Design a protein around this ligand. Sequence first.
Ligand code: HEM
Ligand code: HEM
Ligand SMILES: CN(C)CCc1cc(F)c(F)c(CCc2cc(C(F)F)cc(N)n2)c1
Ligand SMILES: CN(C)CCc1cc(F)c(F)c(CCc2cc(C(F)F)cc(N)n2)c1
Ligand SMILES: C[C@H](O)[C@H](O)[C@H]1CNc2nc(N)[nH]c(=O)c2N1
Ligand SMILES: C[C@H](O)[C@H](O)[C@H]1CNc2nc(N)[nH]c(=O)c2N1
Ligand SMILES: [Zn+2]
Lengths: 411, 411
Amino acid sequence: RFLKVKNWETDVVLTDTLHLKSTLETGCTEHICMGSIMLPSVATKDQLFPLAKEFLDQYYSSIKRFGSKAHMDRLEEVNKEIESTSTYQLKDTELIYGAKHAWRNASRCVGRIQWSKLQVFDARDCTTAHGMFNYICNHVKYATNKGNLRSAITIFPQRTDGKHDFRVWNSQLIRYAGYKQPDGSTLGDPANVQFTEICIQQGWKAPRGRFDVLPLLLQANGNDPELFQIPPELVLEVPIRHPKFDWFKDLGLKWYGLPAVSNMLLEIGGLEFSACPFSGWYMGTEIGVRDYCDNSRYNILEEVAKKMDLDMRKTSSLWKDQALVEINIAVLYSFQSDKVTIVDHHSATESFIKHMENEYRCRGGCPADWVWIVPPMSGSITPVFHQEMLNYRLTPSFEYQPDPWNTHVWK
Amino acid sequence: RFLKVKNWETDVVLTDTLHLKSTLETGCTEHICMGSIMLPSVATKDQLFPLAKEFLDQYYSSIKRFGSKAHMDRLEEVNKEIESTSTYQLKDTELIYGAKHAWRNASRCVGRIQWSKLQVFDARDCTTAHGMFNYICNHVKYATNKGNLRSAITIFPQRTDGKHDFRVWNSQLIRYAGYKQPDGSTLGDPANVQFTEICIQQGWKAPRGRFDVLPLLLQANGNDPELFQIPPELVLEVPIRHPKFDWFKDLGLKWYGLPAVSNMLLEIGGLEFSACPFSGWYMGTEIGVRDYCDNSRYNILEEVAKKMDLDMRKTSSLWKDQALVEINIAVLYSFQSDKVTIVDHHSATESFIKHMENEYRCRGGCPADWVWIVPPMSGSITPVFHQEMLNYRLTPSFEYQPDPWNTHVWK
Ligand code: HEM
Ligand code: HEM
Ligand SMILES: CN(C)CCc1cc(F)c(F)c(CCc2cc(C(F)F)cc(N)n2)c1
Ligand SMILES: CN(C)CCc1cc(F)c(F)c(CCc2cc(C(F)F)cc(N)n2)c1
Ligand SMILES: C[C@H](O)[C@H](O)[C@H]1CNc2nc(N)[nH]c(=O)c2N1
Ligand SMILES: C[C@H](O)[C@H](O)[C@H]1CNc2nc(N)[nH]c(=O)c2N1
Ligand SMILES: [Zn+2]
């Protein structure tokens, strides 16, 4: 019941007891492991109070005030409010604690060594999509910090009934558009082709090019979502050049500095925050490997290998691999030269092992999803490849949610 | 109960019903996924007959003779023999069927597209370590086929009581020795340092160099294991050169052509075969990435990067990654130029997806362990990265077993 995980590079053994506190379910059974399924799968007042009590019990235990009167009263105070309202409201300090621990508990996130330094923006007084725009703009400006990126999250009002939901319809705050061509090909980011068409459907005048920063599509309190263009001065972008190959600039590649996921759901003491955009900084491989070299994304291995003069006839020339390393040297070099925060998969994975050691000592474990933690290139020359990881679901948490354009009853 | 797995590169969906036939347990629960734990964890006559019946029921169903008289008699015949002997003996055709399906069911094996073309050598009449040597020698010669490698397995007598076990103490038939130095460093393969010392303890005159092919250490019917040197003409080796870098030959690297695991246990209808060395051919990354570049193995990224003239000061120069690709181009190129069978991770992973499609149609699924299937470099530019895989344990199977030098009551 007190499980051991081993590092097979260093022979370090850590003991996990935190998984005992785990509540949610993983999708796996004794007879089938679903560790590689990508997206495994109202709320009544009866369900709400154990979840609030559970959350408050760990909140007061963390500020070294577990079981005191100020605890019990808050416990009673929330009990009474759930009786009277069939929901309840977090104190500001509980919101900050909750959001930081949703990130701390995100088993697929390799960046969690920084989980305690998260800037929480309370947008729970917001009522209009224009207000969301204003908040998201302030978030972007703050998080970007002129390239000295800072972790942040902005938390819009919690779900109530379920038909009054705040949603950022964008999957990320800053994403490049994707347009299907007449000849079937795709310009820009193929991932966003559908969302790009939703913005056009709502009146976005697309500059039909490569790296067109999409507009924000914001839904307030269940209403129809509204388009807003982020002031370009707030969208920090990095032109991608190589420290050796001067033809690399002529590729005309660039990326945005700020990774900021906006489609996920934050759960805190049973309260659901449907719009909670959060941002950090990139690990290079997210751009260099997946964004640029996924077959169904920008898919630039072809052109980079052509310009590298590579034996592209055979599979075993490893021309794909060789061009992949150059592309990731270039992403990292471009970001660093522009003083835009970025971490390489070697630095980030070493930090995660050091993070894991901290969490096993002062917390009893660290839920971790190996499938997502190991980088998409050079896996085994990073320390996380050789690290056994227990995956389990703790709360507060970030959860997936349906895309709003399947759920939303339009007008 | 009829689960779906998706490919996120191609949007192909397959439906798994084979997991219903699964019997063993995975280590995961509804509350904790152990998909990244490396080694998760006598036999009575009551337990034996359901396992025999289960196996025979699928054997006759596969030669299109399920439930016939020849089935029922074999069923009765094995029932009677388990009553009378508290164990039983497989027909030759059942041994071949069993061994092929142990490989077919090996969820961590990416090479399984070839599972039906396995050459099974029945060594169940063997009685002495000298006899094992003779059989293993014939296996090596056959499997090597002068570089045109052929899949094979040699099956020594099944376990009976448990103190009369046949064991190949070697983890693989052909492995390089590893010697700890006076200054603490390691010459050769650090993985084998302990086993290398066991061979010296038993009288092996080590040529204390790099790539010293270890001797076979063979235990027959529970007796003390005996040393045998494989005739060097049977050990096919590949000197590693690069198609560009002529200094690469001066690295003095080489590897053996034949991967042949010898420490695992084959389970067929409840019968345990403790010595069942099996061989195929290498995927390049096994050598180029793990053998050569694991920190706790040969660990040659340092020297290769030095000779490549690489910015080794910073982590984010990706000098490790860049040297890793060159090393794997070289392994592949050297093997192919010598006409020694080898597959690149691009060819092998594409074959495994094609293998998966075959198994989902004509079998209802394919147990697969993503953590092991995805190659240790360039993961996401291979199709298996984007393939959801269900892992579950089917039988016949290859299982891990304790190393014999912890179990063996010596003389
Ligand atoms: C500070 C720098 C950060 C880095 C370097 C980082 C890195 C990563 C990476 C590489 C992934 C893999 C998922 C993918 O490849 O798309 C990931 C996932 C994730 N990140 Fe982090 N991240 C950072 C900050 C944050 C912050 C501030 C939050 C929340 C406040 C967060 C929440 C998450 C979540 C919830 C996931 C998992 C999504 C899922 O469950 O599928 N990250 N991160
Ligand atoms: C024919 C060419 C073959 C190729 C290219 C191949 C490739 C691989 C690779 C890359 C692994 C990953 C494990 C590691 O990295 O050490 C593996 C595992 C494995 N292979 Fe295959 N293999 C082949 C043939 C065979 C054969 C003939 C058998 C049995 C008769 C077999 C049985 C296994 C088993 C049981 C494992 C998993 C060990 C475990 O459960 O941890 N393989 N294979
Ligand atoms: C399969 N795809 C669609 C999953 C989508 C997806 C969902 C997530 F929750 C998620 F975090 C990511 C990583 C991007 C990312 C986010 C952050 C954070 F600060 F915002 C930092 C960072 N470095 N990278 C991707
Ligand atoms: C963590 N380590 C110690 C696990 C050891 C280990 C156990 C195994 F069963 C296993 F198959 C391997 C792969 C080697 C291999 C084997 C074969 C086959 F034909 F023999 C073919 C191939 N290409 N590669 C490694
Ligand atoms: C099929 C598989 O689950 C899927 O491709 C996963 C694999 N691991 C990943 N890991 C990260 N970090 N990001 C991803 O999108 C994925 N995709
Ligand atoms: C911790 C982790 O389970 C371990 O390092 C695994 C990861 N995946 C692997 N995959 C393969 N093919 N071979 C391995 O040895 C490993 N090692
Ligand atoms: Zn699992």
